[PDB]
Amino acid sequence: SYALYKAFSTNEQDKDNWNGQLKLLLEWNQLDLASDEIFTNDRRWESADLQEVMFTALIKDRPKFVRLFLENGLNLQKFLTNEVLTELFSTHFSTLVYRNLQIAKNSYNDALLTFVWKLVANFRRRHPLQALFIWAILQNKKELSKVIWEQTKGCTLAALGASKLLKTLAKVKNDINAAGESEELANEYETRAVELFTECYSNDEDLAEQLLVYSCEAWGGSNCLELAVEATDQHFIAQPGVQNFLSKQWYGEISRDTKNWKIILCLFIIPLVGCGLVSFRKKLLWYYVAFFTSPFVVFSWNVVFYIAFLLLFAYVLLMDFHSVPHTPELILYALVFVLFCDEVRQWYMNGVNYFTDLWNVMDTLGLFYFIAGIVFRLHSSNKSSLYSGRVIFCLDYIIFTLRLIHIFTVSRNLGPKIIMLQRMLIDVFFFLFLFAVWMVAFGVARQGILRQNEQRWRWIFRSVIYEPYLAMFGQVPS
Amino acid sequence: VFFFLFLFAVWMVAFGVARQGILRQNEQRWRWIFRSVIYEPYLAMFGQVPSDVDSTTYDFSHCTFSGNESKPLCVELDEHNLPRFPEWITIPLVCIYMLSTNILLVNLLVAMFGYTVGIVQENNDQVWKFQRYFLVQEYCNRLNIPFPFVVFA
Amino acid sequence: ILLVNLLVAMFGYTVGIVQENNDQVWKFQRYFLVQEYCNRLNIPFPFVVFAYFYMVVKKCFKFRNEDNETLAWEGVMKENYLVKINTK
Amino acid sequence: ATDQHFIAQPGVQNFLSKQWYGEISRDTKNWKIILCLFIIPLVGCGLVSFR
Amino acid sequence: NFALKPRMRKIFSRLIYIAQSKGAWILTGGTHYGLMKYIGEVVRDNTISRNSEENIVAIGIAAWGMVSNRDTLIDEGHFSAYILDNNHTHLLLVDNGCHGHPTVEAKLRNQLEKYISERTSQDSNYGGKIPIVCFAQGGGRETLKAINTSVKSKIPCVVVEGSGQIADVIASLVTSSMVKEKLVRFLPRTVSRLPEEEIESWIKWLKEILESSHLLTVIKMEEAGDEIVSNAI
């Protein structure tokens, strides 16, 4: 390249063609020579006909040249048209990445990937730099992407969205080299977003909390705090800035640097809201209502209401259950009607993904068992139906009591252990698999050696499955 | 210890109220509510396997038919003087409770104790010889004879 | 004896793994409950249905300069962090 | 040789999985596969890739 | 046209940080080109970073003959497209005759510099007298004219680098033979258009530069990290 430039520069009719010099040092990778001999004397430039070379620097992987060019001046939206996007996506976008994109859309659909499938269907046939950053990041260019990312305004939203897209394309199980490379680039950009937000929180907290809540004029139609949730970028939320934001939004008006037993003590007796033991920083009737509208105290009131509900259901079910519904059963029915309308309200708010989580499923299932218990309860003077109704209420009280584990996940002490509890399922299933195999192999052998031709189905399972099951608690079959 | 007792109390109440509601009918004595809701599922953590759920080994000599004397009530009877409760809904209930408390919930406590011992041992000797200072000082802050004559001192 | 004391060992090993991920996954799950309690403007729970009636009341009757200001704020620490990257 | 580090690498495991599944693609869920085993004339449907 | 390699970027960002730390004015041309553009952008960056606490003052001094749109009022106007820079908090434009006359701004600028030099404000550590530092990094005639009009006045505290066009010759020369020796090797392409009848004048200009070498200093090559700007000023 240096020999070809020294022959091209010394023709003396080519010194006037510095554009040919720039294209020559563009096709080769001469950065130091181009910087030292094209832009040094600063006698000649226009900042407007540097475009085609710019486009050339986009298409044959010249990140250092486009960094050198943008150091000397260009606006990217002035450079960008829709025709550039149609060239880049219709032609310069590879068919292999399109094939893995369709496989990822068919196997792992998200809202952001649906949006990027919409926009790639648009551009194969207002946010300029984000669009070119998208093209750079799905093409795995990995060094042009940093150069354009340093020019963007909404930086953290771009980094989080790119991490989401690259993890979703990294879940694809053919061409595992591309999957691993996009996975590593995802890790790099989520690290970059975390390390930028820790700086802009470590300087100023309030403008950082303003950064967390701005939708950036429909980037992907979402928020900077929402993209970390949709990507399962749980290292972005485990940092002290977002947790400090969540705690300050969780307490509400009450300051964080007070002890919580004072707070529940002022919950226990109402007119202690007006006293000097609790700080309400972040008049008196406003103190009253801004106390009673905090999230912490409405939760800690709702749990007391729930425990009182369980005590009332137990007193109804065990001690006061006659042929006709008395007063406490009707109070109970009113409380379940309140619970039911709240659950159907949050189901109308959340949508179909409400059915995704198992706790919501078993809450709806328990309310279904309760209304089945009512319609078996009210047909009086049939003793079988009146007993079956109470059996249904007992098997529903089991569900309503096991909801309390999910309720108390919020505490600082029991919380991480209850979250840890769901990581044991494969060990429990391995134990139950081996125990069921040894159980059957012993039970059928003992029942075949001892007895002869049991013709009752119940005393097969009482003596094949049930007694070797009891022999796990030290019963020693007799 | 508190996490173990929290989960065991939740499973205890959820099993005890369900079993007492399926078997019997309108216990009006407060003591035999807590003896059969809290106490027997508590004993079922030491391998006791609650007994009145079988409907074959259930004799009526330990009943009362009405709350008059000591013993618990019967399960509520049929028109043929038979037990009404289903075996197919009380036997697997006892099996699920007995598994979930006597095996899973205890062997989880063993794992959490093992992990806490694995953490705190390098801090253990430091905290011990820090606490050593207080006892050394409070025994050196007294100029007295050995203890049964200290009152004279 | 063997099959229970093997389950104890596997529980101990899984607790030995997942504890450094435990606090991260917990405070990630904290977000959903904080939001779903902050996504409601209501009274404490046994009167919520009346507040629900208030929402029924609704169903019964019926470029930005500070944005660019805070993005221009963000760009400053972006420049400072790029300096902190290549200073390494 | 019992050179089990040579077989624990992703290339030989990818080869073994692609020989184990056979015609069925790897990037599908297995419950669809056992569901098409459970009812035979669901072999001719667009839920399983036979590449 | 103006090239700005990242050394000058780091130096001038550190400079505007120092000037915010000390509470200093920065006098410049103030057009929408190159260095004045970048100084104004870093002024806006420090203006948006802290928003308060001793904000900085950047006086631009322009010619009124080069300005695209000129609107005479008493009533504010909107300047849209030499182009003026956005982010200078104070501008001043010299008045003269016809349009195409550069170097008119230099007389009032250097006279203002002389008056602040002879002004005495005791609440300082210099002994009053309001210390003044001149910088030079680029090339052209007006740079040498500014440095010599500065050094003709006592105490300009001229600082140059070894980076630029005239900064190279002033850094690397430290009589007429050596002047031409460095001038033909560091800038040939401008001197390809220049008659000798003012090149002998430039030899006189640089002679009056090197008359007082204690009032001049240079940022050298291997001071490339931090605190190089404070150690110069």
Numbering used by the authors:
A (entry chain A): 409 to 533, 558 to 714, 722 to 917
B (entry chain D): 867 to 1019
C (entry chain A): 969 to 1030, 1045 to 1070
D (entry chain B): 663 to 713
E (entry chain D): 154 to 227, 232 to 238, 251 to 343, 350 to 408
Give the authors' words.
The ligand-free MmTRPM8 sample was obtained by adding 2 mM EGTA to chelate the trace amount of free Ca2+. The ligand-free state TRPM8 structure represents the full-length structure of mammalian TRPM8 channels with a canonical S4-S5 linker and the clearly resolved selectivity filter and outer pore loop. In MmTRPM8, the selectivity filter is lined by residues 912FGQ914. The backbone carbonyls of Phe912 and Gly913 along with the Gln914 side chain, build the ion conduction pathway with a minimum atom-to-atom diameter of ~9 Å between both Phe912 and Gly913 carbonyl oxygen atoms, suggesting the passage of hydrated ions during ion conduction. In the maps of MmTRPM8LMNG-ligand-free and MmTRPM8nanodisc-Ca-icilin-PIP2, but not others, sphere-shaped density peaks were clearly visible in the center of the selectivity and tentatively modeled as Na+ ions, the cation at the highest concentration in the sample. Distances between the putative Na+ and Gly913 carbonyl oxygens are ~4.5 Å, too far for direct ion coordination, supporting the passage of hydrated ions in the filter. In comparison, in the MmTRPM8 filter, the Gln914 side chain does not form a similar hydrogen bond with Gly913 carbonyl from its neighboring subunit and the atom-to-atom diameter is 1 Å larger than that in MmTRPM4. As Ca2+ has a larger hydration radius than K+ and Na+, the different filter diameters between MmTRPM8LMNG-ligand-free and MmTRPM4 may partially account for their difference in ion selectivity. In comparison, no density is observed at an equivalent site in the structure of MmTRPM8LMNG-ligand-free. The previously reported structure features in bird TRPM8 structures in the ligand-free state, such as low-resolution pore helix, invisible selectivity filter and outer pore loop, and one single straight helix formed by S4-S5 linker and S5, are not observed in the MmTRPM8 structure in the ligand-free state.
Transient receptor potential melastatin 8 (TRPM8) channel is a Ca2+-permeable non-selective cation channel that acts as the primary cold sensor in humans. TRPM8 is also activated by ligands such as menthol, icilin, and phosphatidylinositol 4,5-bisphosphate (PIP2), and desensitized by Ca2+. MmTRPM8 is a homotetramer with dimensions of 140 × 110 × 110 Å. Each MmTRPM8 subunit contains multiple domains, including the N-terminal four TRPM homology repeats (MHR1 to MHR4), S1–S6 six transmembrane helices in a domain swap configuration, TRP helix, and C-terminal coiled-coil.
